[PDB]
mmCIF file of all heavy atoms in Angstrom:
data_model
loop_
_atom_site.group_PDB
_atom_site.id
_atom_site.type_symbol
_atom_site.label_atom_id
_atom_site.label_comp_id
_atom_site.label_asym_id
_atom_site.label_seq_id
_atom_site.Cartn_x
_atom_site.Cartn_y
_atom_site.Cartn_z
ATOM 1 N N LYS F 1 5.381 1.577 -1.472
ATOM 2 C CA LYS F 1 5.113 1.998 -0.094
ATOM 3 C C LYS F 1 3.723 2.611 0.028
ATOM 4 O O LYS F 1 3.302 3.395 -0.831
ATOM 5 C CB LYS F 1 6.191 2.976 0.405
ATOM 6 C CG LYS F 1 5.865 3.616 1.774
ATOM 7 C CD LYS F 1 7.062 4.534 2.121
ATOM 8 C CE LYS F 1 6.875 5.314 3.391
ATOM 9 N NZ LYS F 1 7.949 6.357 3.434
ATOM 10 N N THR F 2 2.972 2.240 1.067
ATOM 11 C CA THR F 2 1.689 2.844 1.349
ATOM 12 C C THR F 2 1.805 3.559 2.693
ATOM 13 O O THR F 2 2.352 2.948 3.642
ATOM 14 C CB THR F 2 0.584 1.748 1.418
ATOM 15 O OG1 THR F 2 0.410 1.169 0.116
ATOM 16 C CG2 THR F 2 -0.767 2.300 1.952
ATOM 17 N N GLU F 3 1.277 4.788 2.751
ATOM 18 C CA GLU F 3 1.056 5.491 4.010
ATOM 19 C C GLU F 3 -0.478 5.552 4.237
ATOM 20 O O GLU F 3 -1.169 6.211 3.490
ATOM 21 C CB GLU F 3 1.673 6.899 3.923
ATOM 22 C CG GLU F 3 3.200 6.878 3.823
ATOM 23 C CD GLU F 3 3.857 8.265 3.752
ATOM 24 O OE1 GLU F 3 3.206 9.236 3.322
ATOM 25 O OE2 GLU F 3 5.053 8.380 4.123
ATOM 26 N N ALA F 4 -0.978 4.868 5.260
ATOM 27 C CA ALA F 4 -2.404 4.812 5.533
ATOM 28 C C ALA F 4 -2.614 5.584 6.827
ATOM 29 O O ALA F 4 -2.116 5.197 7.881
ATOM 30 C CB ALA F 4 -2.863 3.352 5.672
ATOM 31 N N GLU F 5 -3.338 6.691 6.751
ATOM 32 C CA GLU F 5 -3.603 7.519 7.948
ATOM 33 C C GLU F 5 -5.058 7.887 7.929
ATOM 34 O O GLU F 5 -5.467 8.614 7.051
ATOM 35 C CB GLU F 5 -2.820 8.837 7.887
ATOM 36 C CG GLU F 5 -1.321 8.685 7.886
ATOM 37 C CD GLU F 5 -0.609 10.023 8.020
ATOM 38 O OE1 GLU F 5 -1.273 11.071 8.078
ATOM 39 O OE2 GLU F 5 0.622 10.022 8.068
ATOM 40 N N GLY F 6 -5.866 7.384 8.884
ATOM 41 C CA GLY F 6 -7.306 7.685 8.768
ATOM 42 C C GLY F 6 -7.860 7.034 7.492
ATOM 43 O O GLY F 6 -7.609 5.847 7.216
ATOM 44 N N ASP F 7 -8.617 7.812 6.718
ATOM 45 C CA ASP F 7 -9.153 7.317 5.451
ATOM 46 C C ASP F 7 -8.339 7.823 4.279
ATOM 47 O O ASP F 7 -8.822 7.763 3.166
ATOM 48 C CB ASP F 7 -10.648 7.639 5.266
ATOM 49 C CG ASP F 7 -10.989 9.122 5.453
ATOM 50 O OD1 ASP F 7 -10.146 10.027 5.167
ATOM 51 O OD2 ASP F 7 -12.131 9.384 5.906
ATOM 52 N N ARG F 8 -7.087 8.233 4.519
ATOM 53 C CA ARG F 8 -6.242 8.741 3.423
ATOM 54 C C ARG F 8 -5.126 7.749 3.122
ATOM 55 O O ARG F 8 -4.495 7.221 4.035
ATOM 56 C CB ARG F 8 -5.641 10.123 3.752
ATOM 57 C CG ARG F 8 -4.806 10.687 2.609
ATOM 58 C CD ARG F 8 -4.435 12.144 2.881
ATOM 59 N NE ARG F 8 -3.495 12.692 1.902
ATOM 60 C CZ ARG F 8 -3.092 13.963 1.896
ATOM 61 N NH1 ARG F 8 -3.579 14.811 2.805
ATOM 62 N NH2 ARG F 8 -2.228 14.391 0.984
ATOM 63 N N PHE F 9 -4.893 7.482 1.838
ATOM 64 C CA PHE F 9 -3.838 6.506 1.458
ATOM 65 C C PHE F 9 -2.910 7.161 0.461
ATOM 66 O O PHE F 9 -3.352 7.683 -0.564
ATOM 67 C CB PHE F 9 -4.500 5.269 0.820
ATOM 68 C CG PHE F 9 -5.483 4.589 1.752
ATOM 69 C CD1 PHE F 9 -6.782 5.041 1.856
ATOM 70 C CD2 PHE F 9 -5.072 3.561 2.607
ATOM 71 C CE1 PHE F 9 -7.684 4.454 2.772
ATOM 72 C CE2 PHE F 9 -5.970 2.974 3.516
ATOM 73 C CZ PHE F 9 -7.265 3.441 3.619
ATOM 74 N N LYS F 10 -1.643 7.194 0.786
ATOM 75 C CA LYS F 10 -0.641 7.680 -0.143
ATOM 76 C C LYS F 10 0.216 6.503 -0.573
ATOM 77 O O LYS F 10 0.687 5.771 0.290
ATOM 78 C CB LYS F 10 0.218 8.758 0.558
ATOM 79 C CG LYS F 10 -0.669 9.951 0.954
ATOM 80 C CD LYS F 10 0.111 10.981 1.771
ATOM 81 C CE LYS F 10 0.714 12.027 0.855
ATOM 82 N NZ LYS F 10 1.180 13.173 1.700
ATOM 83 N N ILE F 11 0.393 6.303 -1.893
ATOM 84 C CA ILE F 11 1.116 5.156 -2.404
ATOM 85 C C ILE F 11 2.228 5.700 -3.269
ATOM 86 O O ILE F 11 1.989 6.549 -4.141
ATOM 87 C CB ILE F 11 0.164 4.244 -3.232
ATOM 88 C CG1 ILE F 11 -0.909 3.678 -2.291
ATOM 89 C CG2 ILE F 11 0.950 3.146 -3.916
ATOM 90 C CD1 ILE F 11 -2.101 3.140 -3.036
ATOM 91 N N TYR F 12 3.427 5.206 -2.957
ATOM 92 C CA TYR F 12 4.667 5.629 -3.601
ATOM 93 C C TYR F 12 5.289 4.479 -4.346
ATOM 94 O O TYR F 12 5.457 3.385 -3.775
ATOM 95 C CB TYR F 12 5.696 6.084 -2.536
ATOM 96 C CG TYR F 12 5.232 7.204 -1.645
ATOM 97 C CD1 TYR F 12 4.430 6.929 -0.511
ATOM 98 C CD2 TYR F 12 5.605 8.531 -1.906
ATOM 99 C CE1 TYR F 12 3.981 7.961 0.311
ATOM 100 C CE2 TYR F 12 5.177 9.556 -1.095
ATOM 101 C CZ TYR F 12 4.372 9.267 0.007
ATOM 102 O OH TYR F 12 3.966 10.321 0.793
ATOM 103 N N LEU F 13 5.706 4.738 -5.605
ATOM 104 C CA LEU F 13 6.443 3.747 -6.403
ATOM 105 C C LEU F 13 7.850 4.330 -6.598
ATOM 106 O O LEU F 13 7.958 5.460 -7.130
ATOM 107 C CB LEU F 13 5.757 3.585 -7.762
ATOM 108 C CG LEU F 13 6.443 2.615 -8.727
ATOM 109 C CD1 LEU F 13 6.380 1.188 -8.141
ATOM 110 C CD2 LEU F 13 5.730 2.679 -10.086
ATOM 111 N N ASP F 14 8.868 3.575 -6.151
ATOM 112 C CA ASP F 14 10.280 4.002 -6.201
ATOM 113 C C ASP F 14 10.386 5.383 -5.549
ATOM 114 O O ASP F 14 11.118 6.237 -6.018
ATOM 115 C CB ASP F 14 10.797 4.042 -7.644
ATOM 116 C CG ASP F 14 10.992 2.658 -8.232
ATOM 117 O OD1 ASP F 14 10.760 1.615 -7.544
ATOM 118 O OD2 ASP F 14 11.362 2.642 -9.425
ATOM 119 N N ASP F 15 9.619 5.572 -4.478
ATOM 120 C CA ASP F 15 9.571 6.812 -3.699
ATOM 121 C C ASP F 15 8.912 8.019 -4.374
ATOM 122 O O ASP F 15 9.052 9.125 -3.864
ATOM 123 C CB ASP F 15 10.955 7.202 -3.090
ATOM 124 C CG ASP F 15 10.787 8.062 -1.830
ATOM 125 O OD1 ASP F 15 9.848 7.768 -1.021
ATOM 126 O OD2 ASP F 15 11.531 9.077 -1.696
ATOM 127 N N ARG F 16 8.229 7.804 -5.509
ATOM 128 C CA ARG F 16 7.443 8.857 -6.150
ATOM 129 C C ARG F 16 6.003 8.650 -5.800
ATOM 130 O O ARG F 16 5.466 7.548 -5.986
ATOM 131 C CB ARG F 16 7.549 8.797 -7.670
ATOM 132 C CG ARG F 16 8.904 9.235 -8.152
ATOM 133 C CD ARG F 16 8.958 9.285 -9.669
ATOM 134 N NE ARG F 16 10.355 9.272 -10.038
ATOM 135 C CZ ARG F 16 10.824 9.329 -11.272
ATOM 136 N NH1 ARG F 16 10.000 9.389 -12.305
ATOM 137 N NH2 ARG F 16 12.120 9.300 -11.442
ATOM 138 N N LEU F 17 5.349 9.694 -5.281
ATOM 139 C CA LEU F 17 3.910 9.594 -4.938
ATOM 140 C C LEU F 17 3.107 9.442 -6.221
ATOM 141 O O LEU F 17 3.216 10.290 -7.110
ATOM 142 C CB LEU F 17 3.463 10.871 -4.221
ATOM 143 C CG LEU F 17 1.989 10.892 -3.785
ATOM 144 C CD1 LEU F 17 1.821 9.847 -2.707
ATOM 145 C CD2 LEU F 17 1.654 12.286 -3.247
ATOM 146 N N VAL F 18 2.346 8.343 -6.359
ATOM 147 C CA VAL F 18 1.612 8.088 -7.591
ATOM 148 C C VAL F 18 0.122 8.068 -7.346
ATOM 149 O O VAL F 18 -0.663 8.395 -8.258
ATOM 150 C CB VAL F 18 2.023 6.764 -8.283
ATOM 151 C CG1 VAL F 18 3.466 6.826 -8.759
ATOM 152 C CG2 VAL F 18 1.799 5.567 -7.386
ATOM 153 N N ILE F 19 -0.281 7.702 -6.121
ATOM 154 C CA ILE F 19 -1.720 7.839 -5.747
ATOM 155 C C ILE F 19 -1.856 8.492 -4.361
ATOM 156 O O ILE F 19 -1.111 8.185 -3.456
ATOM 157 C CB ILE F 19 -2.400 6.448 -5.728
ATOM 158 C CG1 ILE F 19 -2.405 5.791 -7.129
ATOM 159 C CG2 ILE F 19 -3.810 6.507 -5.126
ATOM 160 C CD1 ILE F 19 -2.699 4.291 -7.035
ATOM 161 N N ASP F 20 -2.838 9.375 -4.220
ATOM 162 C CA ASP F 20 -3.154 9.957 -2.920
ATOM 163 C C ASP F 20 -4.676 10.062 -2.924
ATOM 164 O O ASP F 20 -5.266 10.989 -3.522
ATOM 165 C CB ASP F 20 -2.461 11.339 -2.791
ATOM 166 C CG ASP F 20 -2.808 12.075 -1.497
ATOM 167 O OD1 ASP F 20 -3.673 11.587 -0.723
ATOM 168 O OD2 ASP F 20 -2.208 13.169 -1.279
ATOM 169 N N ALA F 21 -5.308 9.082 -2.281
ATOM 170 C CA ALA F 21 -6.757 8.919 -2.401
ATOM 171 C C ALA F 21 -7.352 8.505 -1.074
ATOM 172 O O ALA F 21 -6.647 8.020 -0.180
ATOM 173 C CB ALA F 21 -7.100 7.864 -3.477
ATOM 174 N N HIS F 22 -8.666 8.676 -0.997
ATOM 175 C CA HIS F 22 -9.424 8.375 0.225
ATOM 176 C C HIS F 22 -10.397 7.245 0.051
ATOM 177 O O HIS F 22 -10.955 7.043 -1.046
ATOM 178 C CB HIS F 22 -10.189 9.629 0.659
ATOM 179 C CG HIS F 22 -9.323 10.683 1.233
ATOM 180 N ND1 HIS F 22 -8.661 11.581 0.464
ATOM 181 C CD2 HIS F 22 -8.958 10.943 2.537
ATOM 182 C CE1 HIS F 22 -7.927 12.374 1.264
ATOM 183 N NE2 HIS F 22 -8.114 12.004 2.513
ATOM 184 N N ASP F 23 -10.593 6.464 1.122
ATOM 185 C CA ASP F 23 -11.641 5.451 1.162
ATOM 186 C C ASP F 23 -11.946 5.171 2.626
ATOM 187 O O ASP F 23 -11.010 5.054 3.434
ATOM 188 C CB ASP F 23 -11.184 4.124 0.477
ATOM 189 C CG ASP F 23 -12.332 3.154 0.311
ATOM 190 O OD1 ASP F 23 -12.612 2.400 1.258
ATOM 191 O OD2 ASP F 23 -12.966 3.141 -0.800
ATOM 192 N N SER F 24 -13.213 5.060 2.980
ATOM 193 C CA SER F 24 -13.524 4.893 4.401
ATOM 194 C C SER F 24 -14.055 3.536 4.831
ATOM 195 O O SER F 24 -14.503 3.389 5.973
ATOM 196 C CB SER F 24 -14.494 5.969 4.838
ATOM 197 O OG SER F 24 -15.654 5.847 4.085
ATOM 198 N N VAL F 25 -14.000 2.544 3.960
ATOM 199 C CA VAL F 25 -14.555 1.268 4.284
ATOM 200 C C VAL F 25 -13.882 0.520 5.431
ATOM 201 O O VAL F 25 -14.595 -0.025 6.289
ATOM 202 C CB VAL F 25 -14.661 0.378 3.033
ATOM 203 C CG1 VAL F 25 -15.199 -1.008 3.402
ATOM 204 C CG2 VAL F 25 -15.518 1.091 1.999
ATOM 205 N N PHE F 26 -12.546 0.428 5.444
ATOM 206 C CA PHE F 26 -11.865 -0.363 6.482
ATOM 207 C C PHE F 26 -10.905 0.533 7.231
ATOM 208 O O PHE F 26 -10.190 1.326 6.615
ATOM 209 C CB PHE F 26 -11.049 -1.520 5.857
ATOM 210 C CG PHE F 26 -11.875 -2.404 4.960
ATOM 211 C CD1 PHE F 26 -11.611 -2.515 3.583
ATOM 212 C CD2 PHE F 26 -12.903 -3.156 5.513
ATOM 213 C CE1 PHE F 26 -12.384 -3.362 2.774
ATOM 214 C CE2 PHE F 26 -13.696 -3.979 4.696
ATOM 215 C CZ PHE F 26 -13.420 -4.075 3.338
ATOM 216 N N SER F 27 -10.900 0.411 8.553
ATOM 217 C CA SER F 27 -10.012 1.234 9.399
ATOM 218 C C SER F 27 -8.810 0.505 9.983
ATOM 219 O O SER F 27 -7.805 1.152 10.361
ATOM 220 C CB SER F 27 -10.812 1.843 10.540
ATOM 221 O OG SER F 27 -11.538 2.955 10.049
ATOM 222 N N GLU F 28 -8.899 -0.823 10.096
ATOM 223 C CA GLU F 28 -7.784 -1.570 10.702
ATOM 224 C C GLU F 28 -7.838 -2.995 10.265
ATOM 225 O O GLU F 28 -8.906 -3.491 9.855
ATOM 226 C CB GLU F 28 -7.867 -1.522 12.251
ATOM 227 C CG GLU F 28 -9.212 -2.002 12.792
ATOM 228 C CD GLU F 28 -9.404 -1.623 14.255
ATOM 229 O OE1 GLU F 28 -8.444 -1.126 14.868
ATOM 230 O OE2 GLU F 28 -10.516 -1.852 14.782
ATOM 231 N N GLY F 29 -6.719 -3.686 10.370
ATOM 232 C CA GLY F 29 -6.739 -5.132 10.117
ATOM 233 C C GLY F 29 -5.357 -5.657 9.885
ATOM 234 O O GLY F 29 -4.370 -4.965 10.169
ATOM 235 N N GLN F 30 -5.243 -6.864 9.346
ATOM 236 C CA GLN F 30 -3.937 -7.484 9.180
ATOM 237 C C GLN F 30 -3.175 -7.006 7.940
ATOM 238 O O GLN F 30 -3.787 -6.580 6.962
ATOM 239 C CB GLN F 30 -4.063 -9.016 9.084
ATOM 240 C CG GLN F 30 -4.326 -9.658 10.448
ATOM 241 C CD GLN F 30 -4.745 -11.107 10.314
ATOM 242 O OE1 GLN F 30 -3.914 -11.986 10.050
ATOM 243 N NE2 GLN F 30 -6.016 -11.357 10.478
ATOM 244 N N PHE F 31 -1.857 -7.166 7.985
ATOM 245 C CA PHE F 31 -0.979 -6.968 6.826
ATOM 246 C C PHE F 31 -0.787 -8.276 6.047
ATOM 247 O O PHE F 31 -0.839 -9.379 6.627
ATOM 248 C CB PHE F 31 0.401 -6.481 7.278
ATOM 249 C CG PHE F 31 0.392 -5.154 7.974
ATOM 250 C CD1 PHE F 31 0.373 -5.080 9.388
ATOM 251 C CD2 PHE F 31 0.403 -3.957 7.241
ATOM 252 C CE1 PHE F 31 0.386 -3.830 10.012
ATOM 253 C CE2 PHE F 31 0.376 -2.700 7.872
ATOM 254 C CZ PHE F 31 0.385 -2.644 9.277
ATOM 255 N N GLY F 32 -0.603 -8.178 4.730
ATOM 256 C CA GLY F 32 -0.272 -9.409 3.967
ATOM 257 C C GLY F 32 0.284 -9.074 2.589
ATOM 258 O O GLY F 32 0.648 -7.952 2.321
ATOM 259 N N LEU F 33 0.378 -10.083 1.734
ATOM 260 C CA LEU F 33 0.906 -9.895 0.379
ATOM 261 C C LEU F 33 0.015 -10.693 -0.539
ATOM 262 O O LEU F 33 -0.633 -11.610 -0.098
ATOM 263 C CB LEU F 33 2.352 -10.419 0.321
ATOM 264 C CG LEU F 33 3.386 -9.780 1.277
ATOM 265 C CD1 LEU F 33 4.646 -10.656 1.318
ATOM 266 C CD2 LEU F 33 3.688 -8.329 0.923
ATOM 267 N N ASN F 34 -0.021 -10.337 -1.815
ATOM 268 C CA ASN F 34 -0.843 -11.076 -2.767
ATOM 269 C C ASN F 34 -0.090 -11.128 -4.073
ATOM 270 O O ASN F 34 0.807 -10.293 -4.339
ATOM 271 C CB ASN F 34 -2.201 -10.325 -2.927
ATOM 272 C CG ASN F 34 -2.783 -10.369 -4.334
ATOM 273 O OD1 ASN F 34 -2.282 -9.704 -5.270
ATOM 274 N ND2 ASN F 34 -3.909 -11.105 -4.491
ATOM 275 N N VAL F 35 -0.390 -12.153 -4.857
ATOM 276 C CA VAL F 35 -0.001 -12.101 -6.274
ATOM 277 C C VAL F 35 -1.192 -12.531 -7.066
ATOM 278 O O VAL F 35 -2.126 -13.191 -6.565
ATOM 279 C CB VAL F 35 1.259 -12.923 -6.697
ATOM 280 C CG1 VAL F 35 2.499 -12.464 -5.936
ATOM 281 C CG2 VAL F 35 1.024 -14.427 -6.570
ATOM 282 N N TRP F 36 -1.213 -12.036 -8.299
ATOM 283 C CA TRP F 36 -2.306 -12.244 -9.255
ATOM 284 C C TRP F 36 -1.723 -12.630 -10.591
ATOM 285 O O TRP F 36 -1.005 -11.814 -11.232
ATOM 286 C CB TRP F 36 -3.218 -10.983 -9.348
ATOM 287 C CG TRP F 36 -4.215 -11.129 -10.499
ATOM 288 C CD1 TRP F 36 -5.388 -11.904 -10.495
ATOM 289 C CD2 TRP F 36 -4.033 -10.699 -11.876
ATOM 290 N NE1 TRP F 36 -5.955 -11.949 -11.765
ATOM 291 C CE2 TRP F 36 -5.183 -11.227 -12.640
ATOM 292 C CE3 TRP F 36 -3.063 -9.969 -12.555
ATOM 293 C CZ2 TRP F 36 -5.330 -10.972 -14.000
ATOM 294 C CZ3 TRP F 36 -3.244 -9.698 -13.918
ATOM 295 C CH2 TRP F 36 -4.347 -10.188 -14.623
ATOM 296 N N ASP F 37 -2.014 -13.872 -11.039
ATOM 297 C CA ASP F 37 -1.581 -14.327 -12.368
ATOM 298 C C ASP F 37 -0.078 -14.097 -12.515
ATOM 299 O O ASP F 37 0.396 -13.627 -13.534
ATOM 300 C CB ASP F 37 -2.331 -13.559 -13.476
ATOM 301 C CG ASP F 37 -3.646 -14.220 -13.879
ATOM 302 O OD1 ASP F 37 -4.239 -14.961 -13.046
ATOM 303 O OD2 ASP F 37 -4.069 -13.991 -15.044
ATOM 304 N N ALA F 38 0.684 -14.459 -11.492
ATOM 305 C CA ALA F 38 2.093 -14.140 -11.522
ATOM 306 C C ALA F 38 2.913 -14.991 -10.575
ATOM 307 O O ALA F 38 2.397 -15.563 -9.610
ATOM 308 C CB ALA F 38 2.292 -12.658 -11.166
ATOM 309 N N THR F 39 4.228 -14.988 -10.827
ATOM 310 C CA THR F 39 5.203 -15.340 -9.798
ATOM 311 C C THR F 39 5.852 -14.014 -9.399
ATOM 312 O O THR F 39 6.332 -13.299 -10.262
ATOM 313 C CB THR F 39 6.287 -16.264 -10.383
ATOM 314 O OG1 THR F 39 5.665 -17.505 -10.802
ATOM 315 C CG2 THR F 39 7.337 -16.529 -9.340
ATOM 316 N N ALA F 40 5.840 -13.680 -8.107
ATOM 317 C CA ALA F 40 6.532 -12.453 -7.687
ATOM 318 C C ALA F 40 7.233 -12.672 -6.365
ATOM 319 O O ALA F 40 6.833 -13.517 -5.572
ATOM 320 C CB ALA F 40 5.562 -11.272 -7.607
ATOM 321 N N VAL F 41 8.274 -11.888 -6.146
ATOM 322 C CA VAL F 41 9.019 -12.013 -4.909
ATOM 323 C C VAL F 41 9.098 -10.683 -4.172
ATOM 324 O O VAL F 41 9.215 -9.597 -4.770
ATOM 325 C CB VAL F 41 10.385 -12.707 -5.106
ATOM 326 C CG1 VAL F 41 11.330 -11.820 -5.914
ATOM 327 C CG2 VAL F 41 10.963 -13.095 -3.752
ATOM 328 N N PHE F 42 8.936 -10.804 -2.850
ATOM 329 C CA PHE F 42 8.790 -9.647 -1.949
ATOM 330 C C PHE F 42 9.976 -9.705 -0.995
ATOM 331 O O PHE F 42 10.301 -10.783 -0.509
ATOM 332 C CB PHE F 42 7.495 -9.768 -1.141
ATOM 333 C CG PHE F 42 6.259 -9.792 -2.011
ATOM 334 C CD1 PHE F 42 5.822 -10.976 -2.594
ATOM 335 C CD2 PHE F 42 5.555 -8.603 -2.281
ATOM 336 C CE1 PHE F 42 4.661 -11.005 -3.398
ATOM 337 C CE2 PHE F 42 4.448 -8.621 -3.093
ATOM 338 C CZ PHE F 42 3.987 -9.815 -3.660
ATOM 339 N N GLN F 43 10.601 -8.555 -0.775
ATOM 340 C CA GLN F 43 11.781 -8.487 0.088
ATOM 341 C C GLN F 43 11.764 -7.172 0.850
ATOM 342 O O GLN F 43 11.309 -6.131 0.352
ATOM 343 C CB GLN F 43 13.048 -8.649 -0.782
ATOM 344 C CG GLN F 43 14.353 -8.724 0.020
ATOM 345 C CD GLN F 43 14.388 -9.899 0.963
ATOM 346 O OE1 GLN F 43 13.545 -10.040 1.852
ATOM 347 N NE2 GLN F 43 15.364 -10.790 0.758
ATOM 348 N N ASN F 44 12.278 -7.226 2.070
ATOM 349 C CA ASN F 44 12.365 -6.046 2.926
ATOM 350 C C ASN F 44 10.921 -5.537 3.213
ATOM 351 O O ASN F 44 10.621 -4.370 3.034
ATOM 352 C CB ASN F 44 13.212 -4.937 2.292
ATOM 353 C CG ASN F 44 14.659 -5.358 2.088
ATOM 354 O OD1 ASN F 44 15.222 -5.182 0.995
ATOM 355 N ND2 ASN F 44 15.230 -5.995 3.089
ATOM 356 N N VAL F 45 10.081 -6.438 3.676
ATOM 357 C CA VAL F 45 8.642 -6.140 3.912
ATOM 358 C C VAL F 45 8.587 -5.581 5.323
ATOM 359 O O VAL F 45 8.785 -6.296 6.289
ATOM 360 C CB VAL F 45 7.760 -7.393 3.806
ATOM 361 C CG1 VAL F 45 6.315 -7.057 4.174
ATOM 362 C CG2 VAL F 45 7.851 -7.972 2.393
ATOM 363 N N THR F 46 8.359 -4.288 5.420
ATOM 364 C CA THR F 46 8.353 -3.659 6.734
ATOM 365 C C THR F 46 7.137 -2.772 6.965
ATOM 366 O O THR F 46 6.648 -2.086 6.042
ATOM 367 C CB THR F 46 9.632 -2.843 6.958
ATOM 368 O OG1 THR F 46 9.612 -1.694 6.126
ATOM 369 C CG2 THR F 46 10.864 -3.660 6.601
ATOM 370 N N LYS F 47 6.697 -2.744 8.217
ATOM 371 C CA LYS F 47 5.657 -1.775 8.624
ATOM 372 C C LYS F 47 6.114 -0.975 9.819
ATOM 373 O O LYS F 47 6.935 -1.465 10.626
ATOM 374 C CB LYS F 47 4.307 -2.476 8.938
ATOM 375 C CG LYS F 47 4.247 -3.412 10.165
ATOM 376 C CD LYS F 47 3.733 -2.669 11.407
ATOM 377 C CE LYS F 47 3.536 -3.627 12.601
ATOM 378 N NZ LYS F 47 3.195 -2.822 13.803
#
């Protein structure tokens, strides 16, 4: 899970906060999914 508010991003794995960091390059845009060197499956994709 990612919480993006302003330039702050909080990322949770299994509901544990693992990153809480800032970046100001992009403020808005589309949602999507990616895989890298993998087969992966995504379920319950919600915003």
Side-chain angles (χ1 to χ4, degrees):
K1 172 179 176 192
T2 293
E3 293 181 335
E5 297 188 358
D7 53 30
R8 182 170 173 176
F9 301 84
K10 298 174 92 167
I11 296 162
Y12 302 83
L13 178 65
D14 288 359
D15 206 39
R16 288 185 199 181
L17 181 67
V18 295
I19 297 164
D20 176 354
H22 287 84
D23 189 274
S24 60
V25 178
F26 306 116
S27 282
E28 55 194 352
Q30 284 168 76
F31 298 97
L33 301 166
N34 144 287
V35 300
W36 171 77
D37 271 25
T39 296
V41 68
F42 299 84
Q43 185 61 301
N44 297 131
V45 175
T46 70
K47 67 95 174 173

